[PDB]
Amino acid sequence: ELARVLRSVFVSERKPALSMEVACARMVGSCCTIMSPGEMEKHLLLLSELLPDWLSLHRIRTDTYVKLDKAADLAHITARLAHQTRAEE
Amino acid sequence: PLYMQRLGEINVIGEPFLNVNCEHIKSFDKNLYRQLISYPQEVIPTFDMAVNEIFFDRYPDSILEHQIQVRPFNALKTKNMRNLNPEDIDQLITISGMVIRTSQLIPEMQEAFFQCQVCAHTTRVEMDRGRIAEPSVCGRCHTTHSMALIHNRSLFSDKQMIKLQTVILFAHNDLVDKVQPGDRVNVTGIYRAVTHIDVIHYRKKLFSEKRVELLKELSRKPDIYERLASALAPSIYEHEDIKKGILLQLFGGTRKDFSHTGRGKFRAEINILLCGDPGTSKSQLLQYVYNLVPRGQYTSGTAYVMKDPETRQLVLQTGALVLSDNGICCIDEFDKMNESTRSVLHEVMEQQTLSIAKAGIICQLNARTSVLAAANPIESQWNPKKTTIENIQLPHTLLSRFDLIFLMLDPQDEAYDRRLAHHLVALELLDMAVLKDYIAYAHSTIMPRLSEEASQALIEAYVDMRKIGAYPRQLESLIRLAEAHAKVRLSNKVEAIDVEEAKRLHREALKQ
Amino acid sequence: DEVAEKCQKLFLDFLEEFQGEIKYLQLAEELIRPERNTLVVSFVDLEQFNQQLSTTIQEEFYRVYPYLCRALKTFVKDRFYVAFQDLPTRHKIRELTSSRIGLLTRISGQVVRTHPVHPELVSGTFLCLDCQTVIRDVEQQFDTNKSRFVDFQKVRIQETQAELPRGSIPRSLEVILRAEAVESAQAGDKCDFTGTLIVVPYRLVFLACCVAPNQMTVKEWEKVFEMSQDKNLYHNLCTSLFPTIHGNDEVKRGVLLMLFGGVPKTTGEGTSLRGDINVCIVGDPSTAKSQFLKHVEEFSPRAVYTSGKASSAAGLTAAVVRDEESHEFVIEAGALMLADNGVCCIDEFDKMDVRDQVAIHEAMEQQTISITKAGVKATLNARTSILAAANPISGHYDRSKSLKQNINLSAPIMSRFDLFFILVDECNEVTDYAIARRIVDLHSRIEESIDRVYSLDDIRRYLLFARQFKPKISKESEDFIVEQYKHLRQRSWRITVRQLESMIRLSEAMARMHCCDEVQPKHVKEAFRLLNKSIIRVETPDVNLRLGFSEYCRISNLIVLHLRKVEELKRSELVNWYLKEIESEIDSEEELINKKRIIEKVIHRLTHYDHVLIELTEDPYLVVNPNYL
Ligand SMILES: Nc1ncnc2c1ncn2[C@@H]1O[C@H](COP(=O)(O)OP(=O)(O)OP(O)(O)=S)[C@@H](O)[C@H]1O
Ligand SMILES: [Mg+2]
Ligand SMILES: [Zn+2]
């Protein structure tokens, strides 16, 4: 679900890559659940480690920036995430 | 070449802005630097063209939001605001200043969108030199005077008017809203007269290695603290404990954020109260502190509402207390002040914040200041009594809020009068100038932290102190004093010596 | 615009193919109704159906909106205005810049002023006065019979308090509502508006279309369920809500109860009974008078904080100010009406003038504020819970004077607080040691010295879930309350019917805390103590292995009640009964042997020291001293 929101965020910002701070702040301000920024950061790290092809992270200077492929089909990605969750069970 | 790495970093991030240091241009080419100073408005387009061509040559597949713009900064002309002359018109200038007010977002047209009234033929006109080149004929039906301007379709740029402490600054596009009132900024921009300054760049370490080595050498002296006590206020005699307390207040404590705990930001800054007969060293000491300490404030015994003549909106002005944020505020004749102001003072003393709810205006302000107050006993003479209220008549709340209270009594001892008269008739330099930067370095660099031994010592001190009567606020003040002494020794850990010295000073003040 | 025609065709496609029933067919058929002329379309359905169209609409909303209206008209005519909802992104008022003009965004704010409904001429049929030529369908750039008019409303909105950066003046924004959006918003409400930022001659104005005010995830729901079944939920919540505060747990219980709050009731006579709780804390300095205010402010998002003297009468309830442009008089909101359905905290309540407290009087009890000033007549809701902090006269509780002489407050103000706690500071070595170690541990070990049973967000979710239940009062609770109030009232702070209503509210709050649909007498017994205690120490001293005074009284009460009930026993039998009754708490052998030790010691101590138990001749008979009540 959060991933979906993330997509919309990158749809809204007209930008190819965004910083951790701004993206996490916007996701928290738009998420259905009240969460801490650290939890959002760990969730983003988990998304990067599970699904690197869709979502990429780049270490620049003293920050890490987030880039995503907007042309990917959301349904197939959701199916892959469900399969991964089933496997982890 | 750092500029190729800068261009690569811009490529990675996609932000089309170049920051160029003017000293680098001066070193590389003095004539080019002179041309930049004389005619910035003509060399900036050339710089933009050159950097754009280089970047497109290196990486031609760049999808840039805007063309790369060059922002020179830190010109040699660091002229004072009062040194402006009619000679430097249309030249680059750099001014350091304080920001007072910032205007709202002002949209300015940069592309006029015109549409034919018959066939809906659309055209765009670039805005140039404050005049609109409105088309008179149609591009399809050739009908004269059939053009209509659409404000919504037109392109707008954000511009902001800012008052700098005064001069008027005009921030455009990206530079807009990057500066908050109450901050110190170095503004680099072109001077223009209609007078105003158009901003090009904003600017928001200070010690060489030899200075740090000298500071370490001085700190390795075990006597430096006492020597620094001798350094403070040379004209003041036999007030060594007062000088020690002033130095500890100058060092202050360390700031801690308790956001994870759910607690409010605890005060970490020291306040000292002085009480005695008038004509003593109170006023001179207050003047000395105000002059020595940067951002210091002197007041005698808050925010207010001002009507904006332009938008008829009620804006807020900051009093001396807010203006002295992160500084030291000193007050004379504390006793002679109105009770309403002293009632207000409780919040700033305790929570370091200030809340106003008046005439529908609700606001909260940060007030990180240290209060150094001087008071006069009500009898104008030290009547033999027991409690300080019996001589000064102050409420228990204000007295409990003070970290340190000192009393200036002129003793009836003849030798003291001899020494005072000799000091007067006979009425160091290496210390205070170094000490300003030393205090700045200590504030910026080091922060102490508490230990287990000091924990046990403080617990024992508290349980012993309560037998004399004791509030947890004096325990907090003792922690702050220990932190200040640890900063004095430039020690990253609070040890037994700091706690023992703080307890000694507190007990000496209580005994007196 | 070719892209506009493409957008119109794609919107027709979405209207005609979205689904196993097409959601919008019934809405389009109802659009024929004259009172219905705007269509509400979800943004999520638009984006899932196709992404290019969704992005184009989000980016060129002003460009394609008339084409969307044309598509709607064509679709309806085959068998009008378009409204959008559920945009996933929220934005701040300070974020509104010129770069966002024409973008479909939704903004959150609070309505402060309203203006009456006006007709706006959209397309006008003009008659030339020279040649009598009728010019029809003339759009307006910002014959009445043949022209088209649309209802209009103007709204003035202000920044929310939470989004307001410190030291910043909350900016105001103008909002234009048309057609069904008119009169859908009321002054003093917080709303999210979906629309665009248009350019008025320049000037910044927002055109809006819509207004804003079981399905929870499985794991959050299960966590809430599990924590709802905790037997020690009350104490765990009390400890977790104030992890860094030592002792004074009665204040913690009171503030938790006022956070839960009771239920409001309106009589058939139209009179509303307050379903909230007001709390007063008065104490000598150096206590935790303030810290509770800060904790409740940071925890509850609907909390407002204020100081005593700095607040005027106008700033608390409301003020009447003349509007510059309209040349009339309007109302500027006060703190109390901004704290609606929240909690308002006042610090240093004593320093406030009587002229301010008399203004507070009405909002205290009647829960509403009435203004009859300068030709302006109005009534406003003030549904707030007030938490007041104060110190006694001269800052120290002087025991040489009476209790009444130690509080400089008016009688009705004293009466209208449900809970009134007075804190007295005493010099005890064990309390000093505990306070010192807690403070130093917090100063040295900031994060590792915090053990929270439940997360703050979890507490917030549980409180939100619990506040919507409305428990019923049982007959047993009814007669228990009757007899308890009998006993209490048969004995300065006089106890009137207001205290009875407070007791009912407290029982309802206890019922809501435990997620019980009915009220039980145990809640009444719990609240009776809290209402009784009044003056309270920081911590009770230990009693000789040590045991607290409250537990000692509890054990004594239990044993006396059991013996007195059996009167209408043996030592071993009574101990066996006690261990049978306390089996719900013991979880280990060590706890059982500890409980046996404790009960043996307590029975011996009562037998030989307090004389409440008398021995009668290895298993001696025990009887109750006939003068214990
Ligand atoms: N039980 C306690 N646990 C932890 N800290 C405490 C406790 N009691 C007092 N303190 C400390 O003492 C301080 C005094 O609390 P405050 O509520 O700010 O003062 P106060 O009692 O309200 O007096 P006023 O009204 O500000 S003049 C707190 O901020 C804590 O640091
Ligand atoms: Mg307080
Ligand atoms: Zn034409």
Author numbering:
A (entry chain 8): 456 to 544
B (entry chain 4): 191 to 355, 369 to 397, 414 to 423, 439 to 535, 544 to 669, 680 to 721, 729 to 771
C (entry chain 6): 20 to 38, 42 to 101, 110 to 172, 194 to 252, 294 to 305, 327 to 604, 613 to 665, 713 to 736, ...
What wording appears in the published article?
Eukaryotic DNA replication begins with the loading of the MCM replicative DNA helicase as a head-to-head double hexamer at origins of DNA replication. Our current understanding of how the double hexamer is assembled by the origin recognition complex (ORC), CDC6 and CDT1 comes mostly from budding yeast. Here we characterize human double hexamer (hDH) loading using biochemical reconstitution and cryo-electron microscopy with purified proteins. Although both yeast and humans use the ORC, CDC6 and CDT1 to load an MCM double hexamer around double stranded DNA, our work shows that there are clear differences in how the two organisms accomplish this feat.
To characterize the structure that is stabilized by ATPγS in reconstituted human MCM recruitment onto nucleosome-capped ARS1 DNA, we analysed the reaction by cryo-EM. As in yOCCM, the ATPase domain of MCM is oriented towards the C-terminal face of a hexameric ORC1–5–CDC6 ring. The C-terminal winged-helix (WH) domains of MCM3, MCM6 and MCM7 contact the ORC5–ORC4, ORC1–CDC6 and CDC6–ORC2 interfaces, respectively. Conversely, similar to yOCCM, the human ORC–CDC6 and MCM rings are aligned so that duplex DNA can traverse the entire length of the complex. Although the cryo-EM density is of sufficient quality to only build 39 bp, we note that OCCM central channel is 185 Å long, which is enough to protect the approximately 50 bp measured with benzonase footprinting. Inside the channel, ORC2, ORC4 and CDC6 contact both DNA strands, and MCM4, MCM6 and MCM2 track along the leading strand via PS1 pore loops arranged in a staircase configuration. ORC6 is absent in the hOCCM structure, which is not surprising given that omitting ORC6 has no effect on OCCM formation in ATPγS according to DNA footprinting, and 2D averages obtained in these conditions appear indistinguishable from reactions in which ORC6 is included. Two tandem WH domains of CDT1 interdigitate between the MCM6–MCM2 and MCM4–MCM6 α-helical bundle (A) domains. The two WH domains of CDT1 are bridged by an α-helical element that packs against the WH domain of MCM6, connecting the N- and C-terminal tiers of the MCM ring along its outer surface. The MCM2–MCM5 ATPase gate is cracked, yet topologically closed, with a recognizable α-helix from MCM5 packed against the MCM2 ATPase domain, keeping the subunit interface sealed.
